[PDB]
Swiss-Prot record:
The chain holds residues 724 to 732 of 732 of the full protein. It comes from the Eukaryota. Heterodimer composed of XRCC5/Ku80 and XRCC6/Ku70; heterodimerization stabilizes XRCC5 protein. Component of the core long-range non-homologous end joining (NHEJ) complex (also named DNA-PK complex) composed of PRKDC, LIG4, XRCC4, XRCC6/Ku70, XRCC5/Ku86 and NHEJ1/XLF. Additional component of the NHEJ complex includes PAXX. Following autophosphorylation, PRKDC dissociates from DNA, leading to formation of the short-range NHEJ complex, composed of LIG4, XRCC4, XRCC6/Ku70, XRCC5/Ku86 and NHEJ1/XLF. Induction: In osteoblasts, by FGF2. ADP-ribosylated by PARP3. Individuals with systemic lupus erythematosus (SLE) and related disorders produce extremely large amounts of autoantibodies to XRCC6 and XRCC5. It is found in: Nucleus; Nucleus, Nucleolus; Chromosome. Coiled coil: none annotated. This is X-ray repair cross-complementing protein 5.
Amino acid sequence: DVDDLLDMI
């Protein structure tokens, strides 16, 4: 989840 949100950044 965290990695995908980081990419969302």
